[PDB]
A paper describes a structure:
We further determined the structure of PAS1 in complex with the antagonist 1,2,4-TMB. The same amino acid residues as those in the hydrophobic pocket are involved in the interaction with the antagonist. The only difference between PAS1 interactions with the agonist and those with the antagonist was found at the Phe46 position. The aromatic ring of the residue in complex with the antagonist is tilted ∼80° relative to that of Phe46 in complex with toluene in both molecules A and B (see “Discussion” for details). In molecule A, the Phe46 aromatic ring is tilted ∼80° in response to the antagonist 1,2,4-TMB relative to that of Phe46 either in apo-PAS1 or in complex with toluene. This change led to the formation of a salt bridge between two amino acid residues, Arg148 and Glu146, on the β5 strand, whereas no such bridge was observed in either apo- or agonist-bound PAS1. In the case of the antagonist 1,2,4-TMB, the equivalent region is completely disordered, and there was no electron density for amino acid residues after Lys155 in molecule B. Interestingly, residue Arg148 in molecule B of PAS1 complexed with the antagonist 1,2,4-TMB is very flexible and shows no visible electron density, whereas the electron density map of the corresponding residues in other structures is seen clearly. The phenomenon is probably related to the flexibility and lack of electron density in the STR region of molecule B of PAS1 complexed with 1,2,4-TMB. The ligand-dependent conformational change of TodS was also supported by the changed overall features of TodS complexed with the antagonist 1,2,4-TMB, which showed mainly oligomerization (bottom).
Residue numbers in the entry:
A (entry chain B): 41 to 154
B (entry chain A): 39 to 166
Write the structure that this text describes.
């Protein structure tokens, strides 16, 4: 399976901790703008109030241990100018005790097709 | 619940090749992501104190790759652009995908040099 295009590390509550350069560039965001704040508040997810609410719901789902995978549109190309379709996933990351300590957000472009 | 925040963090693929590293870890070791991306974590400057520390990180990454959680105190080249040694509480967390395969490893590091040094002053004050 091809490596992600977009990756982000969130805490268990969905706060942004780390994001790769490709995601930062494509949404036109700096890590300092979004670090420590909820992921769904970042520009990728801001097409509308509903895309933000959708993302908030997927994060909360991951926080409680459910793996998420779905197709979503984000402001994710040319510095936040262009919408792309992304195959999106959230992986809860657990410690040995089984506690969710981080979430891993991954994204892979699917716009070229179709 | 809560946990002390990492200071160093990195994402490796299942075989320990470097995918992502935060700015604090890169500047502590004096390296750029581009120097180490796509190559084994154990080759990165942090682990280059000797052939041994290198060899050791390699085995830990292989352990984590098979699904075992790793955690140990170790000294790395992690301050003044990779020139000075610091003690770190080090962990490697295997990350499984929905399908159950290990897809990544998350390397974390908290600097514990201050805590070791205090421990040692106080053990001294204990005899005196
Ligand atoms: C960090 C990150 C991961 C995954 C996605 C879709 C985005 C937009 C950002
Ligand atoms: C990313 C990273 C680099 C170096 C170290 C020691 C740790 C713990 C994490």
């Amino acid at each position: 399976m091809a490596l992600y295009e977009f990756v982000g590390l969130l805490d268990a509550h969905g706060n942004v901790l780390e994001v790769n350069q490709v995601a930062l560039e494509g949404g036109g965001i700096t890590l300092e703008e979004i670090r420590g704040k909820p992921f769904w508040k970042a520009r990728w997810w801001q097409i509308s109030k509903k895309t933000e609410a959708t993302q908030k719901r997927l994060v909360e789902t991951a926080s409680s241990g459910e793996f998420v995978r779905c197709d979503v549109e984000i402001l994710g190309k040319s510095g936040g100018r262009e919408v792309i379709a992304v195959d999106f996933s959230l992986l809860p990351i657990c410690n040995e005790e089984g506690s969710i300590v981080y979430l891993l957000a991954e994204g892979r472009n699917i716009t070229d097709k179709k």
